[model samples]
Target: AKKKVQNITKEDVKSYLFRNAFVLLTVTAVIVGTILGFTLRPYRMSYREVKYFSFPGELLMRMLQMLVLPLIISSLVTGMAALDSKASGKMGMRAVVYYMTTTIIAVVIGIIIVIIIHPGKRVTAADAFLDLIRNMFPPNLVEACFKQFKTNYEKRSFITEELVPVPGSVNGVNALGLVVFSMCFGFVIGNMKEQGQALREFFDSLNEAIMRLVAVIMWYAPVGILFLIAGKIVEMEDMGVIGGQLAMYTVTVIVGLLIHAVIVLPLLYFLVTRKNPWVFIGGLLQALITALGTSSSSATLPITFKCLEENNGVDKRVTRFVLPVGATIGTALYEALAAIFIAQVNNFELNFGQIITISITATAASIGAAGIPQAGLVTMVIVLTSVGLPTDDITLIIAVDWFLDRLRTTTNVLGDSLGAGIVEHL
Candidate 1:
């Protein structure tokens, strides 16, 4: 007779994770997503209610934001100090350039795809751009009454001064601002002497502590994803627009991404590594799952490094240096999606000059783009402004963003992973 089998217990779950973290996390995300879909399926709210979900998402986003400043400081300081090369470092320079190149290409491709597809133009008038404002506001009558009350209650001390944006156009919303700040911080910490070395050591230790914190946060991914997915579905339902067009937009973005991630990036990886992409992913499933759940290349960086060097065969030197730079500036998916969305959604007529500029600028802007928070959104807005697309279009994109954000975030991670494989072989 066969040996009797005991049912799986908590210890079994731990052992399973220890054995197959990636597969487990991925299945977890799927299961959480499915349950969310089922739970939020029936309680369809109006547009107002859906808009309210932004608060919770935004709140979680704030946590991610809190981590970004310190994380960047520690990671950059540690990364630079670890470099033994007297120069800018061999592969590091190349890695940053290659990353920027691919990122620009990705954004440009996205602009082109979105322009050609024109998916948003097909959006019905009922759910057009204005619906967002109309749906959220109480009636004009209520607004007028509120204004009257406000006028009566207000006591004003009038001061006349013209507020203007400072140098570098401190309109206070440019990706360039954040990029400038991050680079300045990195370079300062990087150039210091032995005193700086101790600081770097402190940061290095701190980075490890944060990494453990990341692991803790990850355990909640299933719950986080539950809120995330449910909030997404409910928001779409409220707008009354998650139909074929939304579906098409999601599918189109995914397909274009698939082409780049599955076809293009892997081809590049193979050209360098002489290895198939599947081999890499099989070993790095945990990183990929983290990529999908967190929607951040930077947030996923530590894990990516661990998986590649410890699990896969990449050199630590290459993995460590290449990944940090890549995390900051190398985002092909962002570039591609930027290009596609601008061209496709806004119906912006692009000449060859305009297209080249957009492709180049978008990729460049991605340099130092954060891996967590609304990094993609912040970067995409920069791309949009660069191409003369109206800023208002951002609101529309934000409305449908979460749906595509998940997909694009995953794509960004894939691009980074593929870039790693290419570097390992080179």
Candidate 2:
């Protein structure tokens, strides 16, 4: 019996290590990448050389980008369809409650923090509204797949109207349009229950495939992030001299994350469930750390679900539904902060109209960009576009994205787990 127990315990230890192997390799890679960036920065490689240096990371990014569109469609369709047969009623109601509440709360706190810190000092109000509406429903769905609406005004000497709106276009996924399409189609499919089974299963399988694809990519992220970090870091000429804004930006986000995750979430979890928040939720350290290591909530779900279930004795239905949807609708927190943060960095004083608009888009962008692999880049595009910021400014934040994605992604699961426990409580 003792001999058998030895093998059993040994197997347990082995499996546990196997589960965390990807994360360990990733943290190591980040450390090495940071070292490489600093060491290589002194060498001053020229443009072409830097290009060659970053190619592996570029390859990882391409592979990652390839999956986002498929995931956006399949997951939304499958999730929506699944919600239909069930009342989606209580679960659905609570979903609106938990997700929206936690999301906006995080967002507001992030916004408040950024404001006090006064990070770019940082759009169009009505015309911006037009771009938003236009993107919401593209005239051509096929075009919307790869192009988004942008408006340029040309002054008309011949015509009476000053600077008439020209319908210009920009290359992007027009995500709002796609989301608008998918949800409606899925809703219709859910209503056509008998005939919809085949379609529903197709999307279910599609989402399942993409989710596993996420795991495959999850394993690759460490190597990719390493190269990504090194490539971007080495490009900077004077990291020591002029990057204090980043330091401010970094601390601001950290405080925002710490406040949201530690103070706000724990408080809500405490009052509602009557469970000791920290210690109770603490069992999921493995889960939380996976999000830190993997830096993608959807990719971390398999282990996260296990931690929630076996570790904390949570429910299957909650994990299955709550967590999947949670990853899909990541907290809109960071995107909101990032938009204004960029504005601050650029020293543009935003008006009330634009601030309201930023809030709305940041919330929506996360639903579009949450879990396919550092998808926060996707959110940045939407937020920046809505606020009339230069899309090129993404490079400013890209260097820090690897670390930030970890915290923001953790917020996704932590919010999800809290939602699940709360869902179970009610």
Candidate 3:
């Protein structure tokens, strides 16, 4: 008798290939990166050389970002357009409340931790850069606005610049503006008498196309991440700083993140849903791992949504609405901690009011950070500038930011997933 043939489906092979692909690739990249970074010391690569080698990683990130705007716009517009009127109000309110409350809590936790730890006390000027940019703003509001415009004009800024350069002109790829515009358009579609369904279908198709693009980009993750991780490792070594103090700073930030992610978010989940938070965590592992590799909550959104729907059984409506908003405004925890930590290092004593300002600024600044890696670094300038702290001092934290960015991005996604579950219950 002929031997029986058994079918091995494509799904089976694909599943096996991806079973631990993210974890394995990420670990391998980190290991290789550390080896190259440490052993290749003083082999100074020029900017062009670094950029050349780093291009793969840069391209990978660019691919992810390329889809972010369209993905967010279509996802939000289609989601809002489909949501039932009654359900939309309740879900939207709960999501906003959950996000804002958690954000405040996060900043408060960071503030308390930083105050107690004082991670910067031991480091002196020799260990880090303490330079401050001292461009004077106009005392009058109109003058400052005009001056800001002039600054933008002089630079001939890119339209896709993440942050708005001038107070007066909408001359950039402003994330906040996109969110507002999308929301308004989506709401109008939801309320329209005709053509709304067709428009919603179009947006739904757009979202799917963007998601497929993400999948295509991710197929090359291992190679792109190798260069990316290696580049970061090499860069960090070159920008090495006060070891002991820097270590303390790292611990402080990590501890703050852990407290928020492990304790606070879970407690909220449990309280709102009366379900074991571990169940949520168990489902979230894939997205958490992906976030660590990407160091971008925005890049990890699809994985997060997938895990929520497939593993946690969250309502698609809730996940669709809450996750994207969370990615933007939910960043209070990380940005607040980072800004205050930088302030501490520079020995700029913030009064109570100033700390409050940092909290507020960090919250708003984070919205502008939507869909970018290391965006907190750029937005931190806004936070620092809000309180008259030196924006230039940002360099002090750059050495360790790569690792910290991963951690915080993981926390951001964790918070979003948790919010989805809780909102579903509500």
Candidate of highest TM-score:
2
Q: Taking the tens digit of each residue's C-alpha lDDT, what string does model 3 give over 1-426?
A: 233334433345666558546555655665675566566556887878877777776676556445545655566666556544434556676776767777778778777777677777512221111110111222333332222211222334564534333323312233333445566677788886566767767777877776566555556766665676566555664244545666777787777777777787777677657878777778888888988986766667788877877888777865666665544433666677777777666566555545654565466445434344554434554445434454434433544566777777777777777777777777
Which run of 10 residues does model 2 get worst, by summed lDDT? 322-331
For each candidate in turn, the TM-score is 0.52, 0.74, 0.56
Off by over 4 Å in 2: 1-17, 121-123, 157-163, 217-219, 262-330, 339-358, 368-414, 417-426
Instruction: State the lDDT of candidate 1 residue by residue for 113-157, as single tens digits.
Output: 766776654122222223222322323333321121100112332
What overall lDDT goes with each candidate model?
Answer: 0.54, 0.70, 0.60
**Ten-residue stretch with the least lDDT total in model 3:** 126-135
Question: Model 1 lDDT vs. the true structure?
Answer: 0.54
Ranked by TM-score, the better of candidates 2 and 3 is: 2
Ranked by lDDT, top first: 2, 3, 1
lDDT for each residue of candidate 2 in 306-398, tens digit (9 for 90 to 100): 888788887777555655555444347778877777776656757655665577667765664534555655556555644446654454565
Better of 2 and 3 by lDDT: 2
The TM-score that candidate 2 achieves is: 0.74
